[PDB]
Structure 1
Amino acid sequence: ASPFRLASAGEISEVQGILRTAGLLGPEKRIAYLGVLDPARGAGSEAEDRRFRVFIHDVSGARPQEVTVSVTNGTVISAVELDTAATGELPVLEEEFEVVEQLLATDERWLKALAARNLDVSKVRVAPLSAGVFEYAEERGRRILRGLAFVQDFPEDSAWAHPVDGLVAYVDVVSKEVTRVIDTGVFPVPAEHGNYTDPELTGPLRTTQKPISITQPEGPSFTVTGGNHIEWEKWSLDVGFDVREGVVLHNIAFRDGDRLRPIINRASIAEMVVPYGDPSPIRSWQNYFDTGEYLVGQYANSLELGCDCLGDITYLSPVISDAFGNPREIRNGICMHEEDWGILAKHSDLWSGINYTRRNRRMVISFFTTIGNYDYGFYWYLYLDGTIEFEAKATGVVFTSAFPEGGSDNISQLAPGLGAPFHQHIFSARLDMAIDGFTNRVEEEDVVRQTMGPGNERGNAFSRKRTVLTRESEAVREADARTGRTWIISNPESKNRLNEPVGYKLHAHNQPTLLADPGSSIARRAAFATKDLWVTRYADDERYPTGDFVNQHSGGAGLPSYIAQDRDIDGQDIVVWHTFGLTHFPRVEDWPIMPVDTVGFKLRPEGFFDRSPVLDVPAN
């Protein structure tokens, strides 16, 4: 049906077959990533060729491959062997997660370290963490996973309460060997438990909360057709799902009277990094690209009604591939519903005697994922007035360490002897713009203060200025909250009735960007995170701000590389990449399980419509 429909169990099985019949999917081969490719640029691309891209790992130690197959024509379009030392390692496999603990359990250096701390090896959990790229030359080409230890007193115990500081291991997950064990010294292992379900810690549960019932006696106002095509209050879009990016929104458009007007061609969180700011050798290499290295989509939770999504919910259960090419359904992995959003517009006019009030609503499309200790909710909102917004909610259990005797400038104390290293959660929203079509342009808008004098004798005047970003080399922008800086995406060939180019304005939260020293490895590998806004010319192979293979990749890939092309972006098919994140100095209130904190951004119509697009909402 729609070329944007979600991948089917069958298409996944077919990809598996094709790889097999083609001799690419053997018993020692593993699927590290598989996902459908979006239709190519073609107004009315009639001939539908449903293609899938796969990253195939080899447990034997053979070079991995990137393959594109056509499920429609049962063929292999391309198969390329990869030089990981050059282009980066493949995403971490879920099955490689246990390997770190298993290997270490029989390692003399490891066991020695645990014995010095009087820790029973059978009680020691090891977090399989990405390694990044540091001074260890022997790691280039090898797929390494570093390990940090946490003690689990019993099966249902929260190990995060018991970090084992002063100890870290590096493991080659293919040759299956412990490349190194570093013990900088014994630190007391925090004793208090962090079991948020233990009545002893929670105390008597509240009996004060009365129920809040949210129902829709006539069902929801949105319609879902073709499995994932949404139609709601003038909005139209397709909800896709990718194992790496998670929920992806396609063809976001608004039916302005007679015309279905495009706004955004593709919206997604194309990367998400969590850099740690603790200079201890035990953790200074710590930077998790949850999206790039771990693939947040595969870890999406199966949501539960009433608990995760309240109200009249319509679920999508996306299908993904397992390590062998078998389709796997994420039951109730995506929630879709509309929720009341207070007052939309209101005016009580003395002169006319008319008292007017209208209520707002927002269509919500979300999923929640769990990556080790973190849990993140990704929410996309479409409002009645044309506003588009994204919100990330960060929860989970904070990553712990020992709290140094004498305090720390880079770690905060959560409990006796329990520390929580400073870090950030930085996202990159990739917005493939289509403001009334693909001919777009971006302008940076700053508030302009004016000096009192001739033409402004009362010194009350203030204005605004707009600078068009014409080439990619001038499209790497930073925030300026002081001057109310925003960025407007417009279509210079499409004017509203007042003869001004239609547009949408991006309002950022202006949170701090990547704090790491500019010459650091993380500054190089996640260069996108050092600036708030990037604008590039669209290209079918420029999908992530960090490149295709993030794991153990040297640096400079992605955005810094794309931008180097210096293409024309003034009235062209362009893409906006917005960096936004949370800078977390964990507080006592974040322990033992943290309350949700949030970050996001939104885009509001700016001369897109000819008047308010909500004059037709009834009183109700």
Structure 2
Amino acid sequence: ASPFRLASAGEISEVQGILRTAGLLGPEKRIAYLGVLDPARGAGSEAEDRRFRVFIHDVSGARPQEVTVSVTNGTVISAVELDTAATGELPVLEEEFEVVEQLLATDERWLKALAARNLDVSKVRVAPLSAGVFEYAEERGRRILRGLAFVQDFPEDSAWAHPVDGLVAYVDVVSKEVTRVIDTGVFPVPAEHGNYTDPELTGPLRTTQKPISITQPEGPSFTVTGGNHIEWEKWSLDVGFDVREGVVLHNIAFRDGDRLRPIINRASIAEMVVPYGDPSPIRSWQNYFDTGEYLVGQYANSLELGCDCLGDITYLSPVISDAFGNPREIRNGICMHEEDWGILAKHSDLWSGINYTRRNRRMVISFFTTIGNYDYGFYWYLYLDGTIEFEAKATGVVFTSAFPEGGSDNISQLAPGLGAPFHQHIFSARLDMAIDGFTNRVEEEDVVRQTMGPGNERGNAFSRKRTVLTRESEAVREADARTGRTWIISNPESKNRLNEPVGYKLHAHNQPTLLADPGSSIARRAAFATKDLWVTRYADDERYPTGDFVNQHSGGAGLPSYIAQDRDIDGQDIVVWHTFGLTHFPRVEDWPIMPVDTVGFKLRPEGFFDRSPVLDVPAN
């Protein structure tokens, strides 16, 4: 009954049938994206209309289409032909990945390059990577993937240990032509294997780890209704899933006495870019937009009980569409559970004699995705005290290269002859704010140091200052860790009992933003990543910080074009976009499989409640 319910297999089958009957899903067509559309602002008329957005690719070279379908009414609402040289190419299809290796295996230039290196083509795996936009005029309007080669000595070998440096190819995956093969010179293929399940590498496994048993004898404290509606310790929300963004949180609200108070209307990771910092022409084009180009939701893992998620786990199994419009279930793709989180509050008072301790807990909503060599975990946390936190977990196998004789300023050495180029992993969180409703504003808060003098005779005073961001043109902000800079999202029309506007404070990790030269292709295509915080006025069609069609888009789409509208954001329906990321100089300890590293952000209440919201927590 809820408009925010997950897409059903039956809905996806109906979409397929509607598209086919409209003549839009012939044998040459492929679905590159399918997702449910959120309700438009002000759907309080109960007139639900379940609408889906579809990107349709054509493998014969005809123009792709963007289509909107109403499952409710069984009709095609609109269908638009796309000029991809102008607005960007569609996301990469899973079936295009295998095309690259197969096409190169019969190309005379590729075979000559492998022959010079004494490599058997049957052992050469090709990583098919997105192309970006660079100097090659012949690529405009064509679907291009670039391929880098790795040797697999046997079927269970980790090919990442054996990069074939000095060699790259470009492939037109629609016309099935190899456009360029570039060979800059022969590097030795690193010979040491990286097989982290090989007993010769692991040694005897430890026998010292005794079991930790986490159980909930009476079941979990949260309830799931309507398939995806969560209620837990005064929190209320809906867990959505989209093939591009992955897990999306809707309608985050907190039950404060008799009132259900909204906090965030929609929360998601709306883009994530992995730019590489190696200037070698073999890799200097290398930038993954995992969300926008590959779609992280479609590569979600099935999570195993006891290994991936430990404790009393409740799973969601979202349904997506395959390239032909058939429903596909991602079994156990989302884990949900609560976790003990240490001490919540504690005080032993000498004067009253009262000793007081309470324990904290958090609700966890997570999924894991695998894109080639990398694996990313996305974790959303809700805490008893009103804190909301996001954490990304990065693991998997680092992307490798040869390590040059004589060293490198842009590549780490991991093993003899084996290098790992420097790179970043940068995320964009899109937070459609709704602090006590939709009239919100953002203030930038800095610590203020004060000079010793009159009114501050002992030189101990310090203060803070808040600056309201009033228009989009002034709402592109940078971090300043030294001044303790944070941002407060408040509702100027909703006051706490002290007559102050209710608010939430965003705490960033203050990690470096995009390092590339501002004149680079990646700086133009990932402009969101060059600043820590953006605020825009809500609009239905402003969904992603990089635009709708990221693959091979020439740049400027998304946030820089949105904020040019210079709209009023002072007490309006606003969206906060926060950039955060990891800068990775690989270490020896990251090889041959990398231990998890993390980055994230959190939001804490700031005068949202009239007092601590956890006074009614019982004494365990």
Q: Structures share a fold, TM > 0.5? A: yes
**Which string of whole-angstrom CA distances, capped at 9 and with x for unpartnered residues, describes residues 565-584 of structure 1?**
10000000000000000000
* Aligned twin of 2:102: 102
Distance 1:451 1:75 in 2: 69
Distance 1:58 1:429 in 2: 32
Distance 2:43 2:95 in 1: 42
Distance 2:453 2:186 in 1: 69
Distance 1:355 1:83 in 2: 69
Q: Unmatched 5+ residue regions in structure 1? A: none
Q: CA deviation at 1:475?
A: 0.3
Which sits farther off after the overlay, 600-609 or 18-27?
18-27
Helix, strand or coil at the partner of 2:292: coil
Distance 1:158 1:30 in 2: 32
Distance 1:189 1:498 in 2: 68
Q: CA deviation at 1:559?
A: 0.3
Distance 1:445 1:147 in 2: 46
Q: CA deviation at 1:483?
A: 0.2
Q: Post-superposition, which runs of at least 4 consecutive aligned residues in structure 1 deviate over 6 A?
A: none
Distance 1:562 1:105 in 2: 44
Distance 1:586 1:544 in 2: 30
Q: CA deviation at 1:283?
A: 0.2
**Which string of whole-angstrom CA distances, capped at 9 and with x for unpartnered residues, describes residues 548-607 of structure 1?**
000000000000000111000000000000000000000000000000000000000000
**Which string of whole-angstrom CA distances, capped at 9 and with x for unpartnered residues, describes residues 51-108 of structure 1?**
0000000001000000000000000111000000000000000000001100000000
Which sits farther off after the overlay, 55-64 or 18-27?
18-27
**Which string of whole-angstrom CA distances, capped at 9 and with x for unpartnered residues, describes residues 313-365 of structure 1?**
00000000000000000000000000000000000000000000000000000
* Aligned twin of 1:274: 274
Helix, strand or coil at the partner of 2:294: coil
Helix, strand or coil at the partner of 2:110: helix
Helix, strand or coil at the partner of 2:465: strand
Q: CA deviation at 1:491?
A: 0.3
Distance 1:612 1:77 in 2: 49
Q: CA deviation at 1:176?
A: 0.3
Q: CA deviation at 1:367?
A: 0.1
Distance 1:392 1:538 in 2: 26
Distance 2:45 2:83 in 1: 34
Q: CA deviation at 1:45?
A: 3.8
**Which string of whole-angstrom CA distances, capped at 9 and with x for unpartnered residues, describes residues 426-461 of structure 1?**
000000000000000000000000010001010000
**Which string of whole-angstrom CA distances, capped at 9 and with x for unpartnered residues, describes residues 401-423 of structure 1?**
00010000000000000000000
TM-score (normalizing by structure 1): 1.00
Helix, strand or coil at the partner of 1:291: helix
Helix, strand or coil at the partner of 2:491: strand
2:104 is equivalent to residue 121 of structure 1: no
* Aligned twin of 2:60: 60
**Which string of whole-angstrom CA distances, capped at 9 and with x for unpartnered residues, describes residues 443-498 of structure 1?**
00000000100010100000000000000000000000000000000000000000
* Aligned twin of 1:76: 76
Distance 1:342 1:279 in 2: 46
Distance 1:273 1:424 in 2: 8
Helix, strand or coil at the partner of 1:224: strand
**Which string of whole-angstrom CA distances, capped at 9 and with x for unpartnered residues, describes residues 27-47 of structure 1?**
100000000000110151410
Distance 1:456 1:253 in 2: 43
Distance 2:261 2:604 in 1: 15
Distance 2:554 2:213 in 1: 52
Distance 1:451 1:17 in 2: 72
Which sits farther off after the overlay, 45-54 or 240-249?
45-54
* Aligned twin of 1:414: 414
Distance 1:340 1:254 in 2: 20
**Which string of whole-angstrom CA distances, capped at 9 and with x for unpartnered residues, describes residues 182-233 of structure 1?**
0000001000000000000000000000000000000000000000000000
* Aligned twin of 1:516: 516
Distance 1:465 1:25 in 2: 58
TM-score (normalizing by structure 2): 1.00
**Which string of whole-angstrom CA distances, capped at 9 and with x for unpartnered residues, describes residues 218-266 of structure 1?**
0000000000000000000000000000000000000000100000000
Distance 2:257 2:27 in 1: 56
Helix, strand or coil at the partner of 2:32: strand
Distance 2:459 2:78 in 1: 66
* Aligned twin of 2:594: 594
**Which string of whole-angstrom CA distances, capped at 9 and with x for unpartnered residues, describes residues 270-323 of structure 1?**
000000000000000000000000000000000000000000000000000000
Distance 1:45 1:408 in 2: 63
Distance 2:550 2:405 in 1: 36
Backbone CA RMSD of aligned residues: 0.4
Helix, strand or coil at the partner of 2:94: coil
Distance 1:118 1:32 in 2: 38
Which sits farther off after the overlay, 174-183 or 42-51?
42-51
Distance 1:466 1:189 in 2: 57
* Aligned twin of 2:489: 489
The within-5 A match list for 1:113-192 is 113-192=113-192
Helix, strand or coil at the partner of 2:115: helix
Distance 2:79 2:480 in 1: 46
**Which string of whole-angstrom CA distances, capped at 9 and with x for unpartnered residues, describes residues 518-571 of structure 1?**
000000000000000000000000000000000000000000000111000000
* Aligned twin of 2:302: 302
Distance 1:18 1:361 in 2: 46
Paired positions, count: 620
Distance 2:298 2:320 in 1: 7
Helix, strand or coil at the partner of 1:380: strand
Helix, strand or coil at the partner of 1:444: strand
Helix, strand or coil at the partner of 2:297: helix
Distance 1:68 1:154 in 2: 46
* Aligned twin of 1:225: 225
Residues 7, 359 of structure 1: CA spacing in aligned structure 2 closer, same or farther, 3 A cutoff? same
Q: CA deviation at 1:17?
A: 0.5
Distance 2:415 2:409 in 1: 17
**Which string of whole-angstrom CA distances, capped at 9 and with x for unpartnered residues, describes residues 136-178 of structure 1?**
0100000000000000000000000000000000000000010
Distance 2:227 2:578 in 1: 29
* Aligned twin of 1:337: 337
Distance 2:230 2:180 in 1: 52
Helix, strand or coil at the partner of 1:340: strand
Helix, strand or coil at the partner of 2:358: strand
Distance 2:456 2:116 in 1: 76
Helix, strand or coil at the partner of 1:572: coil
* Aligned twin of 1:3: 3
Distance 2:153 2:535 in 1: 50
Helix, strand or coil at the partner of 2:111: helix
Residues 518, 349 of structure 1: CA spacing in aligned structure 2 closer, same or farther, 3 A cutoff? same
Distance 2:66 2:477 in 1: 33
Q: CA deviation at 1:49?
A: 0.2
Distance 1:407 1:71 in 2: 59
> Percent same amino acid among aligned pairs?
100
Distance 2:434 2:258 in 1: 18
Which sits farther off after the overlay, 449-458 or 41-50?
41-50
Residues 56, 43 of structure 1: CA spacing in aligned structure 2 closer, same or farther, 3 A cutoff? closer
* Aligned twin of 1:194: 194
Distance 1:43 1:374 in 2: 40
Q: CA deviation at 1:21?
A: 1.1
Distance 2:333 2:520 in 1: 37
Q: CA deviation at 1:130?
A: 0.2
Distance 1:69 1:228 in 2: 23
Distance 1:566 1:439 in 2: 18
Q: Unmatched 5+ residue regions in structure 2? A: none
Distance 1:466 1:406 in 2: 52
Distance 1:296 1:612 in 2: 38
